[PDB]
Ligand binder design. Structure first.
Ligand SMILES: [Ca+2]
Ligand SMILES: [Ca+2]
Lengths: 163, 163
DNA sequence: CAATCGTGGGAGACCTTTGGTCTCCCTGCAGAT
DNA sequence: ATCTGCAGGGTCTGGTTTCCAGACC
DNA sequence: CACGATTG
C-alpha cells in the first residue's frame, strides 16, 4: 500500500509512495539560523509537521528512515546535526501517526546493488530515475541525491525491484 | 497563564505551571537500547508525545526549552545525544501545539543568581524547592536536579521571583 | 537504588558465522563556476 | 544557483557592541 | 552533557 521514506539530513527529502504507483518527494524544509556569529541551515520543524499532516498516507503508514550513523572522523558538529535531524524527524513522524522503521544505509544500498560505487550519489539518482521515471526531471542535478535516497528508501520498504 | 519548561537531556524533566499556581514535573521517559553491542539510555519518543497529549495546558502555551550547547571537549557521542534529545523534544512540543522558546542555561541561571556556584546542581534543587515548595519532596535526591532545572526554566518563562 | 568519578568515546549488517570483516554517511566552510 | 573540495570544527549573553569577556552543560 | 565505570 502506502510507504514513506525519509532521508533526514539538511539536503534530504521525504518520499511518499501511494498504492496506485504514484509518488511524491519533497525537499526537507529548512531555515537559516545564526549560530556563533555565522549562518547555519537547520531543518524547519513547523514546516515538516505541516507537510506530514498534509499527506494522504493513512495513519499507521510505515515510514522508513535512514539510521543516523556519522563517522568517527566526522566532526562533533556533524555528530550534533545528524543527531538533531534524526530526533526531529522521528518525533515528527511518530506524532503525525506513522510507524517509524529505522533502516541502515547499507541495507537499502545492498538491496539495490549500490554498495562500493565510486560515484554513489550519481548511481542513487540513476536508480531512483529508473524506479520512478516520472521523477526523472526532479533528479537531474547532483544536489538531488537526497531526493533519490528518500525515494529508494521508500522503494525498499515497498519491495520494488530494478528491471 | 500556563508555562512549560523542558530540560531535554536523558536525566531531564518537563515542568508544567498552571495559572492557579499548581505545578507538575515529570522525569523524561527513556528506554534502554542497544548501540554497537552496548546498552545506552535513550528518550522514549512515544511516551513523550503521549505525555504532552495528556497535559491540560492548552495549544499555544509556550514551552521554554534549554538550548543544547555541548562543550568542545565533550565527545562526539555527547554531541549527537544532545542534538538528538533537543530535536526529539522540539518536534514533540511543536507537534503537540506548543510554542517553543529556546533559553540558554546562562540566561535562567543569571536570572536566579546561580552562576559560578560551586554546587550548581544542589543550588538548582534549592532554588526550585523555594519557588515550588509543594515539590520539595520531589527534589530531595541529587539526581532530581533535572526536575529542578525544568521547574526553573518554567519559572523563568513565567517571570517568578525568588524571595 | 543513589551517588561519584574521569574523560570525551562509531555503528551496522552479514560472513568468514558465537568473532570477523566490510561497509556507510554527514557538516561546515571556502573557492571557483 | 550549482558544484566541488576538504577537513572534521562551540556556543551563548551582555558588557563599553562594532569585539571582548566570561559563562554554560 | 554522554558514557562507562566504581562506590556507598
Ligand atoms: Ca542524504
Ligand atoms: Ca539537565
Amino acid at each position: 500500500g502506502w510507504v514513506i521514506g525519509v532521508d533526514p539530513d539538511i539536503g534530504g527529502a521525504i518520499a511518499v509512495l501511494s498504492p496506485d504507483g504514484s509518488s511524491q518527494v519533497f525537499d526537507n524544509p529548512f531555515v537559516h539560523i545564526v549560530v556563533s556569529e555565522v549562518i547555519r541551515k537547520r531543518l524547519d520543524t513547523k514546516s515538516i509537521i505541516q507537510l506530514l499532516r498534509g499527506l494522504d498516507a493513512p495513519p499507521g503508514t510505515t515510514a522508513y528512515i535512514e539510521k543516523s550513523s556519522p563517522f568517527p572522523t566526522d566532526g562533533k558538529q556533524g555528530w550534533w546535526s545528524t543527531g538533531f535531524s534524526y530526533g526531529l524527524w522521528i518525533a515528527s513522524l511518530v506524532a503525525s501517526g506513522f510507524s517509524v522503521v529505522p533502516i541502515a544505509s547499507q541495507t537499502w544500498k545492498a538491496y539495490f546493488g549500490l554498495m562500493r560505487s565510486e560515484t554513489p550519489k550519481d548511481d542513487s539518482r540513476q536508480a531512483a530515475s529508473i524506479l520512478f521515471p516520472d521523477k526523472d526531471q526532479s533528479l537531474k542535478l547532483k544536489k538531488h541525491h537526497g531526493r533519490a535516497e528518500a525515494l529508494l528508501l521508500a522503494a525498499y520498504g515497498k519491495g520494488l525491484v530494478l528491471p
